[PDB]
Amino acid sequence: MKLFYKPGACSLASHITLRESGKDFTLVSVDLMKKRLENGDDYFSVNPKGQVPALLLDDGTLLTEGVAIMQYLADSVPDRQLLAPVNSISRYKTIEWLNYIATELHKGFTPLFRPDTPEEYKPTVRAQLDKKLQYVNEALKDEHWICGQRFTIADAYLFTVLRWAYAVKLNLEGLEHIAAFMQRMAERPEVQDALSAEGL
Amino acid sequence: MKLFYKPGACSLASHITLRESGKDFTLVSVDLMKKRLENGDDYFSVNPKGQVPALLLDDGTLLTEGVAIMQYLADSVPDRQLLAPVNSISRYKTIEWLNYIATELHKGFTPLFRPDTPEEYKPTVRAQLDKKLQYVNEALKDEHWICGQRFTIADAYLFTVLRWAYAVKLNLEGLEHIAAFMQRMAERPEVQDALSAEGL
Ligand SMILES: N[C@@H](CCC(=O)N[C@@H](CS)C(=O)NCC(=O)O)C(=O)O
Numbered sequence: 001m002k003l004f005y006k007p008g009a010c011s012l013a014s015h016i017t018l019r020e021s022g023k024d025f026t027l028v029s030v031d032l033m034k035k036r037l038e039n040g041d042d043y044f045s046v047n048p049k050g051q052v053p054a055l056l057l058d059d060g061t062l063l064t065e066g067v068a069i070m071q072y073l074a075d076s077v078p079d080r081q082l083l084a085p086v087n088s089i090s091r092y093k094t095i096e097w098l099n100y101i102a103t104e105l106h107k108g109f110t111p112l113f114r115p116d117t118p119e120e121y122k123p124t125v126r127a128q129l130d131k132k133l134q135y136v137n138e139a140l141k142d143e144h145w146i147c148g149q150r151f152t153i154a155d156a157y158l159f160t161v162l163r164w165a166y167a168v169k170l171n172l173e174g175l176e177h178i179a180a181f182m183q184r185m186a187e188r189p190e191v192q193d194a195l196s197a198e199g200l
Numbered sequence: 201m202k203l204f205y206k207p208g209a210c211s212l213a214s215h216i217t218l219r220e221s222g223k224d225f226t227l228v229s230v231d232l233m234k235k236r237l238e239n240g241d242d243y244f245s246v247n248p249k250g251q252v253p254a255l256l257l258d259d260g261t262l263l264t265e266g267v268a269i270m271q272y273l274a275d276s277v278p279d280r281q282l283l284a285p286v287n288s289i290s291r292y293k294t295i296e297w298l299n300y301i302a303t304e305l306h307k308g309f310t311p312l313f314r315p316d317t318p319e320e321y322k323p324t325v326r327a328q329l330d331k332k333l334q335y336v337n338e339a340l341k342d343e344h345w346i347c348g349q350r351f352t353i354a355d356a357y358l359f360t361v362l363r364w365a366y367a368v369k370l371n372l373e374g375l376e377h378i379a380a381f382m383q384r385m386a387e388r389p390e391v392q393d394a395l396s397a398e399g400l
């Protein structure tokens with residue numbers, strides 16, 4: 001498998017998931033300003049949406065959307081319990097967290113990274129995010145993983161996006177459960193290995 | 201089951217999915233300005249995120265996030281083929297579309313519905329949506345469903361959000377595949393019933 005990525009982007013969650021799934025894969029860095037690969041190929045020819053992540057399977061199937069990529073990977077290794085079985089309530093609680101992270105956190109940060117965002121709107125966006133981080137911090141009060149006792153793909157995604165909170169200098173004072181969670185993730189070897197490989 | 205909803209909001213997709221899944225459910229209308237139910241209860245006590253949809257199971261389990269709700273329902277009725285089985289590529293293509301609709305379309309429209317959005321930013325958002333609708337229109341070029349030959353939960357969600365393009369008067373000229381999809385959807389009896397029940 002090939003993972004199309006950019007260091008520290010949302011693709012890090014798919015990258016961590018690949019490692020946690022025990023997969024053989026290679027990383028393919030994308031220049032997202034020119035939308036180009038190192039071999040000169042137009043990235044729009046690979047992913048018409050021009051984003052990372054994308055996962056190219058050996059059969060030539062290209063999967064996009066981080067949440068879809070992480071489910072595909074987790075389903076392939078059910079014994080690792082990265083996602084609970086179909087028709088178990090635990091599964092849909094993980095998918096609930098995945099969708100919240102995708103829609104509320106990841107896309108919540110997006111305007112701060114785009115060139116078409118007016119400067120006057122950024123404080124508004126940052127205020128939205130401050131509120132969402134209070135909710136996440138409360139969800140992490142038992143200080144295990146986001147879904148409770150088991151590490152899941154939701155933890156990989158939440159970690160990736162919360163890193164951005166530090167990148168844009170949100171005020172994280174009083175969010176001690178988030179702090180604990182970030183430390184606990186950085187202690188996982190597969191996480192450390194993904195960060196190292198991305199130069200983070 | 202109880203579906204917490206607001207007419208025409210994103211909860212319409214979960215509503216359509218309940219009907220397509222053949223479930224016994226009741227609709228509970230939420231006043232999202234006051235965050236109140238008709239019995240006077242604070243809706244924040246039901247869903248701390250204060251949003252629709254939410255789905256209350258008879259055992260008292262509350263499931264939020266429309267994508268999660270729709271997977272839970274579809275997986276319970278596999279013979280209806282609303283979501284393909286685990287480890288079929290078809291399933292991940294549907295999940296891919298669900299995530300695209302959630303993050304790029306649904307959250308793409310969100311600023312147009314919020315009171316904290318500056319007027320000057322609205323044209324920018326509308327331009328982003330214009331480009332996304334060209335992509336969706338091309339994805340619908342075979343004029344079946346969004347994942348090809350079978351109707352899926354992705355179609356329920358895509359229809360729900362595309363109705364907003366009409367609501368905010370985006371220009372849909374030249375997007376004939378979208379037009380055909382909207383008509384095909386409105387011809388499904390369960391979709392008709394959901395629209396009727398929401399007063400749409
Ligand atoms: N809906 C996509 C969004 C992916 C996304 O936002 N990718 C960003 C990086 S975090 C990207 O590639 N931005 C580059 C661009 O669009 O030019 C997903 O969930 O995978």
Ligand SMILES: N[C@@H](CCC(=O)N[C@@H](CS)C(=O)NCC(=O)O)C(=O)O
Nearest residue numbers: 103209210232250251252253265266
């Ligand atoms: N991430 C949530 C988003 C749900 C959402 O945006 N709900 C809107 C309706 S489309 C809502 O309840 N808005 C009311 C509010 O937040 O006050 C999901 O995918 O289900």
